[PDB]
Write a protein that binds this ligand. Structure first.
Ligand SMILES: *C(=O)CCCC[C@@H]1SC[C@@H]2NC(=O)N[C@@H]21
Lengths: 510, 588, 96
């Protein structure tokens, strides 16, 4: 299967490289020509030397907005700044002047959600022209629209999660609350401008003509209004000041579990290209994945002989303990009660959960419904929803229907979720949808059946594709399979930084 | 003399040359393959060039790579050592083309002596004895010639190299015990004639065959146009640094010595420490050198490529080092060599040193009834020394004393085995050689008792120091001090004149398997139908074999035989099957 | 070496996409330039501003006074000393 995975990963890396450039070269040239750093160089210049950077949804809005909005005009992710992992959100001013599209709002809110759930300091590198007015009804007014950004700043600030802003360019309308709501705001002299109403509105309302520097320039706010707390000479000076601010926050909390010295895996991670079929119709043993990603290949399987279409067991990844839960076929009732029992063990042992999804669904038929497969699935869903340990999800194959819910899909707030580029996600598989609808059509000629099925397959292939998923932030990114061990390892260091709530479950339908 | 010399070789000979270059004051350049990037010689030289990947054909044999390194570093001459491009005329021609002095004989000599048909024609024209065409009980004898471009030729002495395993030389001596002072003068003059036959210059060695019955009846066998591995025994008996002279000759100086400056102050013997296991039939072996001790007694010399943390691999000749003893007589030199090999300890790699010690204790070797078949006849009666209780107890006591020290006095961590009643012995199951046994230790490291399964009960005291390379065990009052090294899994010990490893091994299961453990059953993972059978019923198959394919939910579940065995098939194509339905049994 | 294998401390520059080179701006003599290093100290590549791209291998021992660099295959062993602000190197017949 290696060549198919290599082609999918080459496509992924080509898309990542294209999105990383941001706007057109004319806009990049004009940005640098004004003496600015490029948004990605702002992010890289903020990190500690050589720090990893776990970018959130780099292919957001891919294939949306006519592809005029690479990465949704935003760079978001986790990097180490002054010795702490921080969530960095930066407006890509080269993409449409940093305009917030609906996906830009969603990406910003997801970065704040990661920061809230993991207690990470937030750094906002603000440089945005405002809302995309043609779709303002999708940028404004709902609960998860642009106003929620400031609700997130305030409540995180109430918890003592530091909110830090650097105003590196325009900051206008409601966006003026990103600096003003932050605990400590930096502004670059003769670049950053903050105002609730800009020059065009001042002119339309009062007839007065003002520049954006006269109205709300960095000198005005740092000397007279007090909206800002530090005045920086340039972008590099702003990043230096932000690093000094972060150095005042003190350390992160130690993990609630024991971390051991990491042990290398027994295999080169590109061996994952050999053992996992790209075609979801080809069965394989998921132990071939597990023993390659875990430290030393050590995996203590729980209930190995029972419910064998679900694999559950304890391992370490980069020294962090994990309870791995992985699909290995169709879910049976036995598999769901196995999963629920294992989640209860991990919850009491304070062990974070790793879900490896490749699930078509539950076993169908009269004897399974009579056996109460829905009640056993509900017990697993209850355990997943109520588990107090961190949950991480990697979709390595199919992710369909109630199997998605039983395996900690996005609705269950896994602390992070990623897709492999071979994955698919939809309420059904494409062939299931085509077969069920053809069964409702009844008898038809094979040449008529194929003509009936082709639009259904096309729909579910188009909507189920990983880039369609990531474009909409249904996941935090498509990742190369061979990076899975690194990504989970990085995430395991992040999710240990929040304290655990006590164990508490809803009523298990016994 | 040259200002920079490249040493186009590896290992013990590279170190040996670099040492002389440093003493002469010449900047020394090494070369290494990627497999030797941690080797000693790259650290002993002043600068080093990675010449290629591990394979010799892509490193030390790659003429363009070695000459490229010589060019890059401004090396003015190349010393080739031996065993690689030291007898390659293409290399010497490429160096001459590069303007770099090959330290060695002319390409015409290398080309002439490289074929025995041509060599015999060249040699016999100078009147040197040549074999008519087999010899009873042959003795390998060889003469070290040294020659310069000004027409001086000298013989430094002869050697005996007849102790050979499958023509691999193992132990060598200078002088030979065979010859007397009258006949060795003839052999020396004849060797000088073989050198003058081909305008030879530099060091070279002439191989003769002699019958054990007729010491005075030589025949020419070979001319080797290089320094030999054996050269140190001559270097010891003469006091002439053959590498220094070979350089000065290549620099164009005269020999600055005469036949009246040659002398033989005693007898010298050397043995080659090889990474080969004689109990496993001399199979080449390797691994990390976890720790090293090399002897430094009076009259002992060590020439070695080893350092702690070096890796031994199969890419090259398994030669590791040479132990050389010089004494007043053959028996004294053999005693000094035996004492040295008793001190030589390589941890992490199994070596022939015990086989060398066995040969050095053979009556034929001690009395000198050598012949080129002797070692090949003697080796089948070598056996390794039995794994005594001492060899297990010393490892058990090391593991136990290490654990006791690491506990730091914390009662729950101290391996005391404390009980309200009789205390539990600290128990180790240890494998060494062909012996697996338990050691039971009671007491404390200062005063303990150890009992071995199938063995005796011994008093033990164990003197462990954190981070020390040495650990001492007093066993029934005999104190022995061991060099020790430990991995995740093996304990390597050297002391008391022997070296071994011990493995800590799992307990045996209390219940042995029934033969049913060789059998297996294949069951359908899904409800579906059998769409293919890949194996005829009741047939032998291997664990790679697809036996039955079930289709369910449009997925082909091809089930693979988990074991080699007779596969019996329980289903036919088109059969509907249930979850867990046996589809085949496979039996031992 | 100081990172001790902790993924967030290791200066890998890891990214989902193309990894970032570890970047140093260094002044020596009258030359100030960036060095960009990619890979890992066993096998790396270094590129220099206004300069070439080289293969690098670097052999660092904690607390050692010696450090070895194999640069385009030429192994050189340097004495090193470091302050809060300067790196003093000596090897290959140079000190700087
Ligand atoms: C063929 O096109 C139908 C495939 C879908 C049915 C199977 S049944 C068992 C799995 N559970 C589910 O919901 N779909 C899968």
């Amino acid at each position: 299967h290696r060549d198919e995975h290599l082609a999918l990963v080459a496509e992924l890396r080509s898309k990542l490289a294209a999105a990383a450039l941001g706007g057109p070269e004319r806009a990049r040239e004009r940005h640098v020509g004004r003496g600015k750093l490029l948004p990605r160089d702002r992010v890289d210049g903020l990190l500690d030397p050589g720090s990893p950077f776990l970018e959130l949804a780099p292919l957001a809005a891919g294939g949306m907005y006519d592809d005029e909005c690479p990465g949704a005009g935003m760079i978001a992710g986790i990097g180490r700044v002054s010795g702490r992992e921080c969530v960095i959100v930066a407006n890509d001013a080269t993409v449409k002047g940093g305009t917030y599209y609906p996906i830009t709002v969603k990406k910003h809110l997801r970065a704040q959600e990661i920061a809230l759930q993991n207690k990470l300091p937030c750094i906002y590198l603000v440089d945005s022209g405002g809302a995309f007015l043609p779709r303002q009804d999708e940028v404004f007014p709902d609960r998860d629209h642009f106003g929620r950004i400031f609700y997130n700043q305030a409540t995180m600030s109430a918890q003592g999660i530091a909110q830090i802003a650097a105003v590196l360019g325009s900051c206008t309308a409601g966006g003026a609350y990103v600096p003003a709501m932050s605990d400590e705001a930096v502004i670059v002299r003769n670049q950053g401008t903050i105002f609730l109403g800009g020059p065009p509105l001042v002119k339309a309302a009062t007839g007065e003509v003002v520049t954006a520097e006269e109205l709300g320039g960095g000198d005005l706010h740092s000397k007279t209004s007090g909206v800002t707390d530090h005045l920086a000479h340039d972008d590099r000076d702003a990043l230096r000041i932000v690093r000094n601010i972060v150095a005042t926050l003190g350390p992160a909390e130690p993990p609630p579990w024991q971390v051991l010295p990491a042990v290398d895996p027994i295999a080169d991670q590109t061996e994952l290209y050999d053992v996992v079929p790209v075609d979801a119709r080809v069965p394989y043993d998921v132990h071939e994945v597990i023993t390659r990603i875990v430290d030393g290949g050590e995996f203590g399987e729980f209930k190995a002989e029972y419910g064998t279409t679900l694999v559950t067991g304890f391992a370490r990844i980069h020294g962090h303990p994990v309870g791995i839960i992985a699909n290995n076929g169709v879910l049976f009732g036995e598999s769901a009660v196995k999963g629920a029992h294992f989640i209860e063990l991990c919850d009491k042992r304070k062990t974070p959960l790793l879900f490896l999804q490749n699930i078509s669904g539950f076993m169908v038929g009269r004897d399974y419904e009579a056996g109460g497969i829905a009640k056993h699935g509900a017990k697993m869903v209850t355990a997943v929803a109520c588990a107090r340990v961190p949950k991480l999800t990697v979709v390595i194959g199919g992710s369909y229907g109630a199997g998605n819910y039983s395996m900690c899909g996005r609705a269950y707030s896994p602390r992070f979720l990623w897709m492999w580029p071979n994955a698919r996600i939809s309420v059904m598989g494409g062939e299931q949808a085509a077969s069920v609808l053809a069964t409702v059509r009844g008898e038809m000629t094979d040449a008529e059946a194929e003509e009936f099925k082709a639009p259904i397959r096309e729909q579910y292939e188009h909507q189920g594709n990983p880039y369609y998923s990531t474009a909409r932030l249904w996941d935090d990114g498509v990742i190369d399979p061979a990076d899975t061990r690194t990504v989970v390892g990085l995430a395991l260091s992040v999710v240990g930084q929040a304290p655990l709530e006590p164990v508490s479950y809803g009523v298990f339908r016994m | 003399t040259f200002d920079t010399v490249l040493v186009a070789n590896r290992g013990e000979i590279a170190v040996r040359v670099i040492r002389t270059l440093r003493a002469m004051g010449i900047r020394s350049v090494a070369v290494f393959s990627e497999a030797d990037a941690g080797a000693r010689h790259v650290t002993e030289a002043d600068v080093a060039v990675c010449i290629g990947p591990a394979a010799a054909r892509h490193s030390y044999l790659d003429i363009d790579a070695v000459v490229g390194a010589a060019r890059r570093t401004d090396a003015q001459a190349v010393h080739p050592g031996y065993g690689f491009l030291s007898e390659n005329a293409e290399f010497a021609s490429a160096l001459a083309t590069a303007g770099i002095v090959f330290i060695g004989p002319p390409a015409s000599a290398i080309a002439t002596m490289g074929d025995k048909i041509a060599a015999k024609a060249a040699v016999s024209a100078f009147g040197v004895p040549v074999v008519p065409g087999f010899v009873q009980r042959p003795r390998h004898i060889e003469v070290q010639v040294l020659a310069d471009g000004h027409g001086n030729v000298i013989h430094l002495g002869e050697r005996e190299c007849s102790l050979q395993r499958r023509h691999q030389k193992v132990i060598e001596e200078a002088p030979s015990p065979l010859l007397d002072e009258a006949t060795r003068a003839r052999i020396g003059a004849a060797a000088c004639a073989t050198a003058r036959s081909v305008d030879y210059t530099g060091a070279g060695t002439v191989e003769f065959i002699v019958s054990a019955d007729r010491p005075d009846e030589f025949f020419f066998m070979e001319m080797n146009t290089r320094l030999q591995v054996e050269h140190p025994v001559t270097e010891l008996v003469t006091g002439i640094d053959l590498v220094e002279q070979q350089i000065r000759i290549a620099a164009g100086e005269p020999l600055a010595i005469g036949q009246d400056d040659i002398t033989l102050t005693g007898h010298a013997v050397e043995a080659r420490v090889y990474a080969e296991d004689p109990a496993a039939g001399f199979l080449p072996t390797g691994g990390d050198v976890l720790g090293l001790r090399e002897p430094t007694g009076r009259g002992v010399r060590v020439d070695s490529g080893l350092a702690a943390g070096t890796v031994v691999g199969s890419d090259y000749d398994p030669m590791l080092s040479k132990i050389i003893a010089h004494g007043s007589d053959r028996a004294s030199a053999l005693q000094i060599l035996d004492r040295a090999l008793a001190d030589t300890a390589v941890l992490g790699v199994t070596t022939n040193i015990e086989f060398l010690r066995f040969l050095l204790a053979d009556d034929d070797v001690a009395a000198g009834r050598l012949d080129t078949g002797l070692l090949d006849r003697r080796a089948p009666d070598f056996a390794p020394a039995t794994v005594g209780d001492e060899q297990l107890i010393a490892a058990a006591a090391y593991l136990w004393a290490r654990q006791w020290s690491a506990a730091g006095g914390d009662l729950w961590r101290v391996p005391s085995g404390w009980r309200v009643g009789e205390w539990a012995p600290a128990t180790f199951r240890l494998h060494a050689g062909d012996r697996t046994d338990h050691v039971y230790i009671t007491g404390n490291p200062e005063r303990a008792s150890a009992a071995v399964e199938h063995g005796d009960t011994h008093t033990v005291s164990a003197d462990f120091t954190p981070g020390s390379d040495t650990f001492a065990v007093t066993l029934d009052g005999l104190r022995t001090d061991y060099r020790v090294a430990v991995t995740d899994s093996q304990i390597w010990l050297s002391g008391g004149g022997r070296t071994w490893s011990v493995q800590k091994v799992r307990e045996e299961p209390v219940r042995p398997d029934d033969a049913h453990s060789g059998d297996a059953e294949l069951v359908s993972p899904m409800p579906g139908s059998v769409v293919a059978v890949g194996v005829p019923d009741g047939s032998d198959v291997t664990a790679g074999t697809v036996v039955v394919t079930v289709e369910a939910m449009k997925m082909e579940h091809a089930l693979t035989a988990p074991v080699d065995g007779v596969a019996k098939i329980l289903v036919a194509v088109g059969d509907q099957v249930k979850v867990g339905q046996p589809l085949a049994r496979i039996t031992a």
